[PDB]
């Protein structure tokens, strides 16, 4: 059976960075080589695996996460990296993490006056655990003597919007990212290459 990578990459609108959606892929035949050799992907970094070999491989099941992020932040989406997005929004594990795919979708995601549909976590109590996801959007005041009592807006707000503009230029452009994870030995294989 063909694999829904077509809808995965061309989903028309990816989820925000903080709320990164997931989708389980199963029983597929994954034509990785025809995907990888495409010219649209600006980067195709892989860890613990090589892209040409991918068809010679065959994992049990694979997950694909998707989010839209800025070019400088794409560098943070790698195993062992640190930074505002890697720490608070989407902590990639300090271990194998499969291929990270990104392309510059500035045409679709950027808009005049700045797209406010995409948001990132400005700060959090502690950095996220690998593949941790949270939707908890509560003002960080903690009340107490240091800041305004809870429910107050004195201590800023947890989320902020990127406001992608064409003017933002090649440095601040919004990239669309998808990342796949491969796990083994815990079950028999169910998807393989062509």
């Amino acid at each position: 059976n063909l694999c829904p990578f077509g809808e995965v990459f061309n989903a028309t609108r990816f989820a925000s960075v903080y709320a990164w959606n997931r989708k389980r892929i199963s029983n597929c035949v994954a034509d990785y080589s025809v995907l990888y050799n495409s010219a649209s992907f600006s980067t195709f970094k892989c860890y613990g695996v090589s892209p040409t070999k991918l068809n010679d491989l065959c994992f049990t099941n694979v997950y694909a996460d998707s989010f839209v992020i800025r070019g400088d932040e794409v560098r943070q989406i790698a195993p062992g990296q640190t930074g505002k997005i890697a720490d608070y929004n989407y902590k990639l594990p300090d271990d194998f993490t499969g291929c990270v795919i990104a392309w510059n979708s500035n045409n679709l995601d950027s808009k005049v006056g700045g797209n406010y549909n995409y948001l990132y976590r400005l700060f959090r109590k502690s950095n996220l655990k690998p593949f941790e996801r949270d939707i908890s959007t509560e003002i960080y005041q903690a009340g107490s003597t240091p800041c305004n009592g809870v429910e107050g807006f004195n201590c800023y707000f947890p989320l902020q919007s990127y406001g992608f503009q064409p003017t933002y230029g090649v440095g601040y452009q919004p990239y669309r990212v998808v990342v796949l994870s491969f796990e083994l030995l815990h079950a028999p294989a169910t998807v393989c290459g062509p």
Epitope: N107, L108, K111, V112, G113, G114, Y116, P166, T167
Partner: antibody
Framework: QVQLVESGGGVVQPGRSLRLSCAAS????????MYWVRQAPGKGLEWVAV????????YYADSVKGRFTISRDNSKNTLYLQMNSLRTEDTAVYYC?????????????WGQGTLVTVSS | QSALTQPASVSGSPGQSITISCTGT?????????VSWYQQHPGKAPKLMIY???KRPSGVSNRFSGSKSGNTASLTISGLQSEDEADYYC??????????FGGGTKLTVLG
């Protein structure tokens, strides 16, 4: 298919205000952007105004900045332009245009502009 | 307004190759690559032909190609069929979030 239609443009005397409407169907009007462009008969094209998907931001050419106002109702797939203190240089054809997946900054789709002239 | 400069008219024999040029400021066509080209036959709404990085929209013949060189960009048309005589305008985005249009070039084919 996508189509746009402009309406309300016509003869007026100088110094008056006038309102133009543009209506779009066939696409998510709320998602992209709307632009206004005018063409004085016998001359090239020049940009008049623009509005953002949410309508929160507006920009205007120096010739019309502050004089004109752009507004939209994303609940009706309808666009509006408000003109004030019209002058003899505003006697052009005005087209409405929107962004698309090719680029929000690109005038992908165009209507069929109305003709407006100020004359005493 | 820093309206872009263009040749007032260009002409070519059917089937030949012809190129239209557009020129602007280092912050009007230099830097950004969003230069786009529009086509307008008389009596009707303009069409577009080229956009960022010379890309071409679906449903338009591959006869049109675009090029950029710093302060200048150009549109080259080949296989003149006499239907391309419609005037062509270049457009680009600028710092301080402003759009500029070229003076428009009228194409005459010796049909």
């Amino acid at each position: 298919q996508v189509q746009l239609v402009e309406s309300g443009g016509g003869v007026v005397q100088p110094g008056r205000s006038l309102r133009l409407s543009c209506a779009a169907s066939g696409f998510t009007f709320s998602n992209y952007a709307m632009y206004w462009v005018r063409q004085a008969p016998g001359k090239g094209l020049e940009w008049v105004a623009v509005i953002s998907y949410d309508g929160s931001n507006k920009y205007y050419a120096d010739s019309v900045k502050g004089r004109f106002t752009i507004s939209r109702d994303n609940s009706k797939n309808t666009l509006y332009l408000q003109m004030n203190s019209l002058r003899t240089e505003d006697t052009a054809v005005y087209y409405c245009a929107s962004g698309s997946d090719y680029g929000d900054y690109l005038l992908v789709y165009w209507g069929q502009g109305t003709l407006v002239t100020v004359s005493s | 307004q820093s309206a872009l400069t263009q040749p007032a008219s260009v002409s070519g024999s059917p089937g030949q190759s012809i190129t239209i040029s557009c020129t602007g400021t280092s912050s009007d066509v230099g830097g950004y690559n969003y230069v786009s080209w529009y086509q307008q036959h008389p009596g009707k709404a303009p069409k577009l032909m080229i956009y960022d990085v010379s890309k071409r929209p679906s449903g338009v013949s591959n006869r049109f190609s675009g090029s950029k060189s710093g302060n200048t960009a150009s549109l080259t048309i080949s296989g003149l069929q006499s239907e391309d005589e419609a005037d062509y305008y270049c457009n680009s985005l600028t710092s301080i979030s402003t759009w500029v249009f070229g003076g428009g070039t009228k194409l005459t084919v010796l049909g």
